[PDB]
Design an enzyme around this catalytic site. Structure first.
Site, PDB file in Angstrom:
ATOM      1  N   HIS B  41       0.814  -1.231   0.000  1.00  0.00           N
ATOM      2  CA  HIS B  41       0.000   0.000   0.000  1.00  0.00           C
ATOM      3  C   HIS B  41       0.850   1.285   0.000  1.00  0.00           C
ATOM      4  CE1 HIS B  41      -0.063  -0.513   4.465  1.00  0.00           C
ATOM      5  NE2 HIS B  41       0.351   0.745   4.365  1.00  0.00           N
ATOM      6  N   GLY B 143       2.135   5.817  10.006  1.00  0.00           N
ATOM      7  CA  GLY B 143       3.550   5.731   9.637  1.00  0.00           C
ATOM      8  C   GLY B 143       4.246   4.469  10.130  1.00  0.00           C
ATOM      9  N   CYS B 145       3.469   1.415   9.391  1.00  0.00           N
ATOM     10  CA  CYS B 145       3.415   0.323   8.414  1.00  0.00           C
ATOM     11  C   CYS B 145       4.799  -0.107   7.979  1.00  0.00           C
ATOM     12  CB  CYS B 145       2.534   0.688   7.231  1.00  0.00           C
ATOM     13  SG  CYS B 145       0.851   1.152   7.695  1.00  0.00           S
TER      14      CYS B 145
HETATM   15  C1  LIG Z   1      -7.399   1.687   7.086  1.00  0.00           C
HETATM   16  O1  LIG Z   1      -6.026   1.822   6.717  1.00  0.00           O
HETATM   17  C2  LIG Z   1      -5.536   0.978   5.756  1.00  0.00           C
HETATM   18  C3  LIG Z   1      -6.273  -0.011   5.116  1.00  0.00           C
HETATM   19  C4  LIG Z   1      -5.663  -0.808   4.161  1.00  0.00           C
HETATM   20  C5  LIG Z   1      -4.324  -0.631   3.848  1.00  0.00           C
HETATM   21  C6  LIG Z   1      -3.577   0.351   4.477  1.00  0.00           C
HETATM   22  C7  LIG Z   1      -4.174   1.156   5.436  1.00  0.00           C
HETATM   23  O2  LIG Z   1      -3.508   2.091   6.185  1.00  0.00           O
HETATM   24  C8  LIG Z   1      -2.361   2.739   5.616  1.00  0.00           C
HETATM   25  C9  LIG Z   1      -1.834   3.690   6.653  1.00  0.00           C
HETATM   26  N1  LIG Z   1      -2.019   3.168   8.000  1.00  0.00           N
HETATM   27  C10 LIG Z   1      -1.223   3.532   9.007  1.00  0.00           C
HETATM   28  O3  LIG Z   1      -0.241   4.250   8.844  1.00  0.00           O
HETATM   29  C11 LIG Z   1      -1.640   3.054  10.367  1.00  0.00           C
HETATM   30  C12 LIG Z   1      -1.168   1.836  10.850  1.00  0.00           C
HETATM   31  N2  LIG Z   1      -1.328   1.407  12.108  1.00  0.00           N
HETATM   32  C13 LIG Z   1      -1.954   2.213  12.958  1.00  0.00           C
HETATM   33  C14 LIG Z   1      -2.477   3.481  12.612  1.00  0.00           C
HETATM   34  C15 LIG Z   1      -3.143   4.326  13.535  1.00  0.00           C
HETATM   35  C16 LIG Z   1      -3.649   5.527  13.136  1.00  0.00           C
HETATM   36  C17 LIG Z   1      -3.534   5.941  11.820  1.00  0.00           C
HETATM   37  C18 LIG Z   1      -2.895   5.163  10.898  1.00  0.00           C
HETATM   38  C19 LIG Z   1      -2.332   3.911  11.265  1.00  0.00           C
END
Ligand SMILES: COc1ccccc1OCCNC(=O)c1cncc2ccccc12
Ligand SMILES: COc1ccccc1OCCNC(=O)c1cncc2ccccc12
EC number: 3.4.19.12
Lengths: 304, 304
Positions: B41, B143, B145
């Site tokens: 992604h 961030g 990921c």
């Molecule tokens: C719904 O998001 C996605 C769905 C499919 C694919 C990717 C998705 O995210 C991409 C970005 N994500 C992150 O950076 C994220 C990762 N973990 C905790 C978090 C807490 C608060 C805001 C973001 C995050």
């Protein structure tokens, strides 16, 4: 989101860990620049432990008696000195992996990461707090002496703890990196009163703010309190008295959540008086006091 | 003594962390040998996220569009390929800090350390479990990921997880290092049923053995049970059924403590039916399921 007992990344500290052997005793040392720091009890046997005369025991030792091994290579010891309860072994080689570092004396209630080591090899990393009574509730076995506690600010490792012993009660005691024990503890195998411990009130409040930031809000109530009223409750439940300095440190979390510190105090008062009623907060069924307000913001902001 | 949620030392993994930028999105990559692994992604914008056509989005990207930075230096991308939900960026330089490593697919109920990273920089390390429903209860922000989960056996890092997203429920989902999601999750911004979770029974029992090894014995009773009787209780309390394979894995802890597995099951049955009555076990007021029998023995034996 999510809230975990997160430790600092241990890499910079792993690169400093060495094994120190003296006579038949082996423990861990911390190699920074051309100095190896380790607990002075490396020079004791077993008949010594009940009441060692460290000065006399050290006089019988020479530089060549301290075997220092960094991974597979041997370090040449060219000097030895005792500073409080630590030994400082001068070696002829500066550690190439020495990070930027400071030696700091942490305050009770502050947190730090511990890199548990055996035979100069790291086995695990965990986050803990210096208890108000200057003990740490760690996880240490025989051979873990010389394992250190630290904090990391960007590229600087602030070493705050060196593990020395486990008290008969099963809690841990150690020194700052100048060999000064935290608390009244002595490096002798005797019964040592740890003294009354208390819960770190400012940390519980910080963790309650972390709960709200992460969605757990069931404990928020329609009440408020004063510092004096809250402190009467804190006294009854063996919590540290909350001061205005603590309210001030909670300022950023109060602004983030929009929940006044005294309002959060009234939630904490209610949880202390009524319990959790079988509910949980951030996956815990008790009130957690091992996260400082700085830790909560660091974890909730992603500081690397 | 003492029992902590101990993570593996993160040094070997810190040395693999890089930042990967594609377009306006930045996340973490894992640099092993001459390959950088990151969530696919990284090629999505925001209009894409609801239902990305990854094949089409990747076709618009060339090697020069993937910016890979390891600390302060830039890596030259000479190949790119998508394997399941991960991107594999071939770089012209093998990571000098590549540890011995394997890619493993962990089983639900198994544990691992997570090195949370932002902008290719490590911020913290914590221990967690793959839930029976294939989610992880982590601590991750925007961030994070590309942050990975791993286990370490002596000098070998077994990478088991790569972080991809947070579900609307606040729990985390990701892939193995071949890009295969754990669970039914898809890398799309849609509501995704995590499915009923259960408590990892074998882990709770292992943790109950850790409690006995470390002095907490109040919960030991005069009772025993059968696997069938225990499993009727486990079903009522949403615990995974205990099998003879689980009894067999608990063999070493049963021998260490001299407490038969079915006797420990009867203690667990009583704790499930009566609660803790305001008491704690290893500093917890609930039954902990994030320690495997292997973790309990590793922590209680000091494996480095
Ligand atoms: C719904 O998001 C996605 C769905 C499919 C694919 C990717 C998705 O995210 C991409 C970005 N994500 C992150 O950076 C994220 C990762 N973990 C905790 C978090 C807490 C608060 C805001 C973001 C995050
Ligand atoms: C009473 O011991 C000492 C007193 C004064 C000075 C030193 C003492 O110990 C020296 C050795 N200690 C350790 O290696 C130890 C450290 N932590 C946890 C443990 C758990 C079980 C067995 C041993 C340990």
């Amino acid at each position: 989101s999510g809230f975990r007992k997160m430790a600092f990344p241990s890499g910079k500290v792993e690169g400093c860990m060495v094994q120190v052997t003296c006579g038949t005793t082996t423990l861990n040392g911390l190699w920074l620049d051309d100095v190896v720091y380790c607990p002075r009890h490396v020079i004791c046997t077993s008949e010594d432990m009940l009441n060692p005369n460290y000065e006399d025991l050290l006089i019988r030792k020479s530089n060549h008696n301290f075997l220092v091994q960094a991974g597979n290579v041997q370090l040449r010891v060219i000097g030895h000195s005792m500073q409080n309860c630590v030994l400082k072994l001068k070696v002829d080689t500066a550690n190439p992996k020495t990070p930027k570092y400071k030696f700091v004396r942490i305050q009770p209630g502050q947190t730090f990461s511990v890199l548990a080591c055996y035979n100069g090899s790291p086995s695990g990393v965990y986050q803990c707090a210096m208890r108000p009574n200057f003990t740490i509730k760690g996880s240490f076995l025989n051979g873990s002496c010389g394992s250190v506690g630290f904090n990391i600010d960007y590229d600087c490792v602030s070493f705050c703890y060196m593990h020395h012993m486990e008290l008969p009660t099963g809690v841990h005691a150690g020194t700052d990196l100048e060999g000064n024990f935290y608390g009244p503890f002595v490096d002798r195998q005797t019964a040592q009163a740890a003294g009354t411990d208390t819960t770190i009130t400012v940390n519980v409040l910080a963790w309650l703010y972390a709960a709200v930031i992460n969605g757990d809000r069931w404990f928020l109530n329609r009440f408020t309190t004063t510092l004096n009223d809250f402190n009467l409750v804190a006294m009854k439940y063996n919590y540290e008295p909350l001061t205005q300095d603590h309210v001030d440190i909670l300022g950023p979390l109060s602004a983030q959540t929009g929940i006044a510190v005294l309002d959060m105090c009234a939630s904490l008062k209610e949880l202390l008086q009524n319990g959790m009623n079988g509910r949980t907060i951030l996956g815990s069924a008790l009130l957690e006091d091992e996260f400082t307000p700085f830790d909560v913001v660091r974890q909730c902001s992603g500081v690397t």
